[PDB]
C-alpha cells in the first residue's frame, strides 16, 4: 500500500527486501550489517537508509540505549535529505523521527521536524494535528491553540482537533465553552479522542458549571478502562494498590511520621508563622485552577523528592525533622508544603494525578467553625495538633468559611503498598 | 508547568529516554 521505492530502488528491491527479511526475523546485527552494505554501494538509495534507520531503532530497543536512538534519528533524517524520496517513505521517517525524539525528550527537535512535515505536507490534517502536540508537550499552549484552530477552519468536525481545542480551553479557564468540543470530540470516536484526560476535564468543566451529566462521563471513562473508580480517577497510577478515600496511620503503617509530626506540632507552626509575618513571599498562590474563590497559598519545601534549600531556610527546623523520614521526603510524585486558606475560599471538586501517594495534613492553626474537607462521600475537620490522611487521587473539596486563616501541613507520602523497587523508578510527578 | 495537586498539564510527567 505504502509506495516506499523510487525508480532506482526498484531495480535493487531483491537485495532490499533480504535485509529487511532479516531485519523482521529479529536477527537485528546481520540487519544492521546489510543495510549498511547496501548503504556504502547505494548511498543515495532512500530504502536502504530507511532500512538502516529502523535497524538502529530496533537496536536502541534491544540494547535500551539512548545513544543508539539518538543515531537512529539522526539517520531518520539522512532519508529525508536524499534525492527522490518517495512522499509515502519521506512522511514515514520524519514521522518516527519526531516519535521517537518526543520518547528522548528532545520536544524542541520534535517540533522542528513537525513544522518541517507540515510544509512538505500541507494538506495533511494529522500532521497538523500532531504539530498542536508537539507545542502541547513544551507547554506552549498559545501556539497550539492557533494549530487546532486553523484545522477547525478546514475540517470543523475533526474531533482530534475538537478534543485538544477543548482541554486547552479548559485549561485557560473557559470552562463553558470546552464543553461542547470535549464532548463532540470525544463522540467523534476518531483516533486520539479515548484518552482519559479528555472524559476527565469534560465531567469537571461539568461539573464547574452544575450539570448533572458530569458523573455520566466519568461512568463512561470507567468502562472504557481510563479510570480506576468513578470517583478515583487519576491518570498516573500503578495498578493494584488498596484504594478507600480516608486512611488511619496505622493502617499506612507510617505510625512514626505521624507521631513525629503531633509531637513536634508547634515548632511546624510556628515556623510557618514565622515565614507568614516575615518572608510571606514564600507562599505562592494556587495555580492549578482548583480555586472557584478566594485566596490559597502554598510555601513549599520539598517537590519531586528534592528539597528546596531557599525555602528550607525559611523553616529549617522543620526541614532537619522531616529529612529522619525518607518515605515523605523521597516521595516523587508528592510534595511536602505548607498550605493557607482565607474565609471566602471554596476549591472545586478535584483530583491529584496519581494513585502512588498518600496525603497526610497536619493541623497548625484551625479555626473554631467553618473550615471543612470532603473526600468521596465523607467531610472532615482538622483538628491543631492532629494528622488526617487521605488519598487525594479520590475526589475532593474544601471550604473556608470562618472568620480567621486556616494554616495547615502537608506531607506526601509514597503509597504503603508500593515496594522499594517502584518508589526507585516511577518518573517523578 | 508540573501537576502538584491537579491534572491541570497536558502531560504530569518528562520523558527523558529509556
Ligand atoms: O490537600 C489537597 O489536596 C487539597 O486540595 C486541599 C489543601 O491544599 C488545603 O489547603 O486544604
Ligand atoms: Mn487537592
Known sequence: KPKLLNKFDKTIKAELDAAEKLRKRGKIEEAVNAFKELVRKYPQSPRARYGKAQCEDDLAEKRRSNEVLRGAIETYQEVASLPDVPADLLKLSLKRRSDRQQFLGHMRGSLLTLQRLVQLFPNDTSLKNDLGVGYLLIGDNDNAKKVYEEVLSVTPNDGFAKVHYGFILKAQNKIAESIPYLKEGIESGDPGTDDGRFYFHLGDAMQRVGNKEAYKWYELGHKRGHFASVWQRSLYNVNGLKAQPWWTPKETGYTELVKSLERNWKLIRDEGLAVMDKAKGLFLPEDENLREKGDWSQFTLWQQGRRNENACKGAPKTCTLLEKFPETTGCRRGQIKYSIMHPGTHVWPHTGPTNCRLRMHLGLVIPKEGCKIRCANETKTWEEGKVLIFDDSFEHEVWQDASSFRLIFIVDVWHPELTPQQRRSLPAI | ?18
Open chain 2, 1 to 18: 508547568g508540573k501537576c502538584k495537586d491537579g491534572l491541570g498539564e497536558y502531560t504530569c510527567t518528562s520523558l527523558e529516554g529509556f
